[PDB]
Symmetry: C2
Subunit: 518 residues, 2 copies
């Protein structure tokens, strides 16, 4: 083999073969088979004209079970880095056409190398999952592989943003790396499912055979389990959303979130946000409409939109700077916080704090969801997570009480003693040690029965308590709230608060970590 011009030609042939991921039948079975190929997903995700793929030809070293038979350059996963809206982002994309996107030892080591490079230079990692699980043929070595990926996920946790696009049939080990990341974007009709244990070990423990698509699918994890943060109906929408999610996040924990507008129409508001809240204190309203008039162009990327809807969590921008919002939702469970809600908010809060994203709390909550069901499932420890998340956080934190704020939930939404930097309240704010009714009863236990009607006093007591305490001015007089303000001022007020808090630095006791309730 002497010619060089001939060698460059053979290189082209080899790479052309490697790109097919084994199966010019399979990949060609790409543009009308339901899903896109690993490479096609990567083409959509990256600007593409400046980057590199690593370990392109790396193959499995296992021999057992005919693994010596096949080659498959890359061993089932494409790893490397690129540009997304001009920012460096690492990524891997498993190729289902190669042994069911099975996780081989080499396949795992490519994902790990990717994570190592990303960690070294402070770049986000996007995992486009499309794997059925462990590569059975490689035995315990496949489990070692998973273990190595997981360890990287934990090392990268809170250091670099980790986003996973669940675009395949994940089972067993395949579900845990995504769980360790910060956000899971899953397709409903273009990607399909994820579960620890398959229907097989249980289908002889009941009796219903669930064909294929979305069994323990997206709908289940996005509305019931809370494992999925965003559910989309397409792979194109899955990648588009990834880009949009990346745009609100910094590249690492050493950088401030991106300012992509940096425009400051913060000057002022005049879109009567006060009309949103009903004159009647018992009537609901869409809290999202309030965040719309507060944030730039009304934009808001909601996280966990279809899970634990009693609280709202998501990203937006104020004066061009990204903010994280945690707001009670009056349209679901009367705005009461839940076990799911508490979990939803707690993780969003810690994530925001880890990546230096200011936190804005919009409050209207009567308390927690009552019930032996909640207590039995441990609302006591799940609810404590929010208290921990806020207290732990050092990012700028501002609370705006729009309406109700009672008892423990009042505290969980972030108050001064818990570490709130600034607390504001609308004239409609109502802070109370507990629900007025609940407070009046105990506060007059013996009376209420020594008058002229066991129901009379619950007015001269319930309505009077609200007039003398169900207001923002009692807490304001005690210095618990910094100020009471006109609803239309909220944006200008948040703008000035964040601007001043911009260079906030606090203190924390040295520890390997804490022990938040799980």
């Amino acid at each position: 083999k002497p010619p060089v011009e001939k060698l460059i030609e053979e290189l082209r042939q080899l790479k052309e073969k490697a790109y097919k991921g084994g199966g010019d039948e399979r990949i060609q079975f790409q543009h009308s088979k339901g899903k896109l190929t690993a490479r096609e997903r990567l083409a959509l995700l990256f600007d593409d004209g400046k980057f590199n793929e690593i370990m392109t030809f790396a193959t499995t070293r296992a021999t057992e079970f005919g693994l010596d038979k096949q080659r498959f350059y890359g061993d089932g996963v494409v790893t490397g880095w690129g540009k997304v809206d001009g920012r460096t982002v690492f990524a891997y994309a498993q190729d289902f056409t190669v042994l069911g996107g099975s996780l081989g030892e080499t396949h795992a080591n490519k994902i790990v190398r990717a994570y190592e490079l990303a960690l070294k230079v402070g770049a986000p990692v996007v995992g486009i999952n499309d794997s059925g699980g462990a590569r059975i043929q490689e035995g315990a070595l496949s489990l070692e592989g998973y273990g190595a990926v997981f360890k990287m996920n934990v090392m990268a946790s809170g250091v670099i943003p980790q986003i996973t696009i669940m675009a395949g049939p994940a089972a067993g080990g395949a579900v845990y790396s995504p769980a360790l990341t910060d956000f899971i974007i899953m397709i409903k009709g273009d990607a399909y499912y994820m579960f620890v244990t398959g229907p097989e070990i249980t289908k002889v423990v009941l009796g219903e055979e669930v064909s294929f698509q979305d069994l323990g699918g997206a709908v289940v994890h996005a509305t019931k389990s809370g494992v999925v943060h965003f559910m989309v109906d397409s792979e194109q929408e899955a990648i588009n959303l990834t880009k949009r999610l990346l745009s609100y996040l910094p590249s690492n924990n050493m950088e401030e979130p991106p300012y992509i507008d940096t425009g400051d129409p913060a000057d002022r508001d005049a879109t009567g946000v006060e009309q949103i809240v009903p004159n009647d204190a018992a009537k609901p309203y869409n809290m999202r409409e309030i965040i719309y008039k507060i944030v730039d162009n009304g934009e808001f990327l909601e996280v966990h939109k279809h899970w634990a809807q009693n609280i709202i969590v998501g990203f937006a921008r104020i004066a061009g700077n990204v903010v994280g919002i945690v707001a009670n939702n009056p349209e679901e469970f009367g705005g009461s916080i839940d076990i799911d809600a508490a979990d939803k908010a707690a993780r969003f809060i810690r994530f925001c704090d880890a990546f230096n994203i200011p936190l804005i709390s919009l409050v209207d909550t009567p308390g927690y969801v009552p019930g032996t069901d909640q207590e039995y499932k441990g609302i006591i420890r799940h609810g404590a997570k929010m208290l921990y998340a806020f207290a732990e956080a050092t990012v700028p934190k501002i609370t705006v009480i729009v309406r109700k704020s009672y008892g423990g939930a009042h505290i969980a939404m972030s108050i001064k003693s818990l570490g709130a930097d600034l607390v504001y309240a609308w004239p409609t704010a109502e802070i109370a040690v507990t629900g007025p009714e609940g407070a009046v009863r105990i506060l007059y236990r013996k009376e209420i029965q020594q008058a002229s009607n066991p129901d009379d006093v619950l007015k001269q007591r319930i309505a009077e308590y609200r007039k003398l305490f169900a207001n923002p001015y009692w807490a304001a007089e005690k210095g618990l709230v910094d100020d009471v303000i006109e609803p239309k001022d909220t944006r200008r007020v948040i703008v000035a608060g964040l601007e001043m808090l911009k260079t906030k630095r606090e203190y924390r006791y040295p520890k390997k970590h804490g022990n938040i309730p799980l």
Copy 2:
């Protein structure tokens, strides 16, 4: 286990894992209540931890649960296995099921093969020696030595120091 792990690590208490687990409890109830994110907490807790960590597999450790009890790639410092240890990518049956299709309904043999190949696989894989030959376990040991081994291991690891990436904190699943 996750919270116990994190608490011990935070207060410098060595961690000893004693393994015998087939995997996770199946069913919609578990999946619906998010076993995926809860299960991940153990993986995080162990990987996170820097105190001395030693694993002793007494019997089985299959699939994901095998990893969650702490393996070397996840950060275990030392891994030992009793002669009875049985480490597998998944339950041997579930494994054999897959690894022997294309020959389970095509072979001129009815259905007694699933039990034979299930037994061969266990004899061929369900043994500490395969993992030990791959460097996955440091050694296979005589049950009665478990104490001596943990003692030596802890004595040596007592001055252990690892290295962690600077961060305000992490984002373990909740």
